[PDB]
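To whoever picks this up:

The nightly regression suite flagged Thiol:disulfide interchange protein as changed. Nothing in the input moved, so I suspect the structure step. Input below, exactly as stored in the fixture:
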Amino acid sequence: SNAQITDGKQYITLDKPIAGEPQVLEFFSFYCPHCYQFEEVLHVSDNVRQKLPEGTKMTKYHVEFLGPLGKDLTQAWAVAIALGVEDKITAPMFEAVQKTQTVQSVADIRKVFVDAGVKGEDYDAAWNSFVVKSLVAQQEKAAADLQLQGVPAMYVNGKYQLNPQGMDTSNMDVFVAQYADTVKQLVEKK
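Regenerated output under the current build:
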C-alpha cells in the first residue's frame, strides 16, 4: 500500500507532545532483544536513513531499566557519544551482550570499546569526567520525565512515536520497508 498511515496504526502520538525538544530521538538498551533484531539483523536505522529527510539526524540515547548493568550502561554510552562511536560499538557490542553473552562486568564492556577503536585513556578518563555526568543527565531528563518507559522506541516531529506493534511483521523484509515509509511520512504530516 504505502504513503498512507494512521494515528494508532503504524505510528502513535506522544503522551505529552509539547515544546521544541529533539525533533527525532531513539531509545533502547543493549539487553533489549527487539532492538537486537532492529540493529544487527533487520538493520532498521540504515533502512530508515535511505528514506530520511535532511533534518532528522540519527540519535541513540541509552536506558537503564534493562538488566543489572542498567546503571553501568548509562555511564559507558556517554564515553561513546562524546567521541561519536556509537554505531561502531553497536554491532560488536551486541554480539558480546546477546549472541555470545560475555558481557558481565564493566571490564568486559570497555574491552569492546577498545577493540572497536577507543583509547584506553578516554574510557578511564571520561568515566569520571563531567562530560559524562552531563551526558547521563540528558537521559535522566529525557527518560525520567514520564514520557516513555519501555523500548525500542523512535520519535518523529517532536510529537509522534513509531509503532512496530502495528505493522506488517509477517515477512520482516516487508516490515522494515514500510517502517521506514511511515518514519519519512510523519515529517511532512506536521
